[PDB]
Design a protein around this ligand. Structure first.
Ligand SMILES: *[C@@H]1O[C@H](CO[C@@H]2O[C@@H](C)[C@@H](O)[C@@H](O)[C@@H]2O)[C@@H](O[C@@H]2O[C@H](CO)[C@@H](O[C@@H]3O[C@H](CO[C@H]4O[C@H](CO)[C@@H](O)[C@H](O)[C@@H]4O)[C@@H](O[C@H]4O[C@H](CO)[C@@H](O)[C@H](O)[C@@H]4O)[C@H](O)[C@@H]3O)[C@H](O)[C@H]2NC(C)=O)[C@H](O)[C@H]1NC(C)=O
Ligand code: HEM
Ligand SMILES: O=C(NO)c1cnc(NCc2cc(C(F)(F)F)cc(C(F)(F)F)c2)[nH]c1=O
Ligand SMILES: *[C@@H]1O[C@H](CO)[C@@H](O)[C@H](O)[C@H]1NC(C)=O
Ligand SMILES: *[C@@H]1O[C@H](CO)[C@@H](O)[C@H](O)[C@H]1NC(C)=O
Ligand SMILES: [Ca+2]
Ligand SMILES: [Cl-]
Lengths: 104, 466
């Protein structure tokens, strides 16, 4: 890193001078808890038919969505104390913080 | 194996299986497409699979400026020494700047309206065109850069192109940090969790890891519960803009043409300000505009965003609900009855138990958004701990934090303390009436609204060198 710098680098490199990639772009996420994969290192839960998670069947994501998330839109509650701008700033801010690449 | 067209489960695809009696997809040989996130180390049999953050974790307006060198220079106007961001070369919003167009190979924005032929916009982050409300926020911050650069060139004639861009970039970033930590976050977390996870800033600590945690990329998706099933556009009297005041979300996704050929950003910003958010309720989690018809225009089948969330958490190998509760120091329910107390909702605890078998297995987004909201907050205790912890890290571990000594002068910090999102909207659009602060609480016109003349402009006097 340079000794002095008035501005951020674009990658975020050199913000931390002891560990200069911390918070820089195109780096692994930090893990706050160890990963939990079906085979322990790479395959996600639900990948292999009949392989249970902590001794129970893995629930289809679409089925949980159908059963718990789905509601009739005519029941929608407007939030009296929040603007839609509160939703939009969250998205915008998320976009300043993380993007998890996937292959094209 | 093309994940978008095929339902085969082979790398890099992890398609979402369809249960019987699905309310939309009647063929169980079909799937919701899903591409696994890129591994940090592909093909390894040593490392535990981890994913990549392509962006800077810092609250540094990288969505405006970019996170990688070639993008960042291509976002700048290198035709003069004015320190500007590049602007659309074919279109303007009633004489005000739009984002430049991107050149992609399979541009989804074109697919939303084959007749308009309007491509996706080019910004610092690749998702700027995802919804026109987001495009409006990106366009706003592009304009603020350009405005601040102009004033800096008048305040300091000796400053060259590079100096103007960097000084204007530094201010914009501080404004994102101020709006986020002063206005946005207290309304997310509530006062009890704000005080607990984000106590008064002291100064930069170089031992605080500023990386985004893998769980955060999923927890912060709590926002999907705030999404209204329409885009709302309003004219200069804040009344519905005809002939299409409420467009359904499934026809705005990557609909960049709506900003370009349907009124600009003014009507979109007014709608954001004067329409309430959707309230998250335990029996009203997320609307079908995103649960049934997400990106319907741009691909073969409509996606299910909450379901994609749960699939992504598994893809990322994220532990379940009880494991995160334990991380956060919160009790971990084991029985339906305990889950019922923690949720203050036995009916929902029963649904979750039938789906998951045990609360240990509840996927983090689902567990997270299921919790009753904190007083004056918009997340439950678990999410408030996760989001809070991430934000304190991003602040305390950022050497360029706006309050950190030497980043700005004492007079510059005093001026920046006066900034607001309403005032930025005033200074960069044709909008003369905006929300009273806090803009994220204010939602009712005329009651919560005021004239742009009542709000003080940022004073750039302390940036003059003389
Ligand atoms: C600059 O920031 C540092 C990081 O601060 C943390 O993150 C911030 C966002 C904020 O939330 C802080 O509250 C966080 O702490 C901070 O340095 C940390 O300082 C603490 C307190 O000294 C350290 O915590 C100690 O760690 C030891 C060792 O065990 C820890 O690590 C293992 C392995 O990961 C885990 O198994 C443990 O659970 C711990 O996490 C603990 O030992 C003993 O300490 C006490 C008595 O001496 C006693 O209470 C305990 O019962 C125990 O016997 C200790 O308790 C405590 O957990 C932490 O590890 C430090 N982090 C780093 C990165 O160095 C700086 O202090 C801060 N500086 C200033 C001036 O603010
Ligand atoms: C118009 C509204 C929105 C749309 C259409 C949308 C769509 C998406 C999609 C498609 C994903 C990826 C799904 C996957 O494959 O895993 C995603 C992820 C995400 N979203 Fe949303 N989103 C919206 C609003 C928000 C809001 C308001 C917030 C926050 C308050 C938010 C936070 C996130 C985060 C953090 C990710 C993961 C980002 C990454 O690391 O790549 N979203 N969303
Ligand atoms: O808005 C989002 N979050 O707030 C968001 C949207 N889309 C994806 N990924 C899916 C995606 C991304 C893009 C991207 F990144 F180019 F915008 C384009 C498409 C597609 F296929 F619809 F064109 C899908 N990820 C996200 O985080
Ligand atoms: C660069 O700046 C000039 C002066 O404002 C402007 O006319 C021109 O369109 C800009 N070029 C680009 C690519 O933004
Ligand atoms: C597509 O855009 C054109 C203008 O190019 C507009 O008049 C037409 O309505 C749009 N299509 C739809 C379905 O709205
Ligand atoms: Ca960033
Ligand atoms: Cl994690």
């Amino acid at each position: 890193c340079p000794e002095q710098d008035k501005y951020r680098t674009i990658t975020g490199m050199c913000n931390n001078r002891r560990s200069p990639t911390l918070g820089a772009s195109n780096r692994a996420f930090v893990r706050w808890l160890p990963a939990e994969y079906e085979d322990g290192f790479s395959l996600p839960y639900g990948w292999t038919p009949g392989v249970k998670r902590n001794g129970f069947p893995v629930a289809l994501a679409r089925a949980v969505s159908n059963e718990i998330v789905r509601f009739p839109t005519d029941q929608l509650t407007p939030d009296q104390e929040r603007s839609l701008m509160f939703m939009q700033w969250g998205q915008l801010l998320d976009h300043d913080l993380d993007f998890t690449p996937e292959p094209a | 194996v093309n994940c978008e067209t095929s339902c085969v489960q082979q790398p890099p695809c992890f398609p979402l299986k369809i249960p019987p009696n699905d309310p939309r997809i009647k063929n169980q040989a079909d799937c919701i497409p899903f591409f696994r996130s890129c591994p940090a180390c592909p093909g390894s049999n040593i490392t535990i699979r981890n994913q990549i953050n392509a962006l800077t974790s810092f609250v540094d307006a990288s969505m405006v400026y970019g996170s990688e060198e070639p993008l960042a220079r291509n976002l700048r106007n290198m035709s003069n020494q004015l320190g500007l961001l590049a602007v659309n070369q074919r279109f303007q919003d009633n004489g005000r700047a739009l984002l430049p167009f991107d050149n992609l190979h399979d541009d989804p924005c074109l697919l939303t309206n084959r007749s308009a032929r309007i491509p996706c916009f080019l910004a610092g982050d690749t998702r700027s065109s995802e919804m026109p409300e987001l495009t409006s926020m990106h366009t706003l911050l592009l304009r603020e850069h350009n405005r601040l650069a102009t004033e800096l060139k008048s305040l300091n004639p000796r400053w060259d192109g590079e100096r103007l861009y960097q000084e204007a970039r530094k201010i914009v970033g501080a404004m994102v940090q101020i709006i986020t930590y002063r206005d946005y976050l207290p309304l997310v977390l509530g006062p009890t969790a704000m005080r607990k996870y984000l106590p008064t800033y002291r100064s930069y600590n170089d031992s605080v890891d500023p990386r985004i945690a893998n769980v955060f990329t999923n927890a912060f998706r709590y926002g999907h519960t705030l999404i209204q099933p329409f885009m709302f556009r309003l004219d200069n009297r804040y009344q519905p803009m005809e002939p299409n005041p409420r467009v359904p979300l499934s026809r705005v996704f990557f609909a960049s043409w709506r900003v370009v050929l349907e009124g600009g950003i003014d009507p979109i910003l007014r709608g954001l300000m004067a329409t309430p958010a959707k309230l998250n309720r335990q029996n009203q989690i997320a609307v079908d505009e995103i649960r049934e018809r997400l990106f319907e225009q741009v691909m073969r089948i409509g996606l299910d965003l909450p379901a994609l969330n749960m699939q992504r958490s598994r893809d990322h190998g994220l532990p379940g609900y009880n494991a995160w509760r334990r991380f956060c120091g919160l009790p971990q329910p084991e029985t339906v009855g305990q889950l019922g107390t923690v949720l203050r909702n036995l009916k929902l605890a029963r649904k979750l138990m039938e789906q998951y078998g045990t609360p240990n297995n509840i996927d983090i987004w689902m567990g997270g958004v299921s919790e009753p909201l904190k007083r004056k907050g918009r997340v439950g205790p678990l999410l408030a701990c996760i989001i809070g912890t991430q934000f304190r890290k991003l602040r305390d571990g950022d050497r360029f934090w706006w309050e950190n000594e030497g980043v700005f002068s004492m007079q510059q910090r005093q001026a920046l303390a006066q900034i607001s999102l309403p005032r930025i909207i005033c200074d960069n659009t044709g909008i003369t009436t905006v929300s009273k602060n806090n803009i994220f609480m204010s939602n009712s016109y005329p009651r919560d609204f005021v004239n742009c003349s009542t709000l003080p402009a940022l004073n750039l006097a302390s940036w003059r060198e003389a």
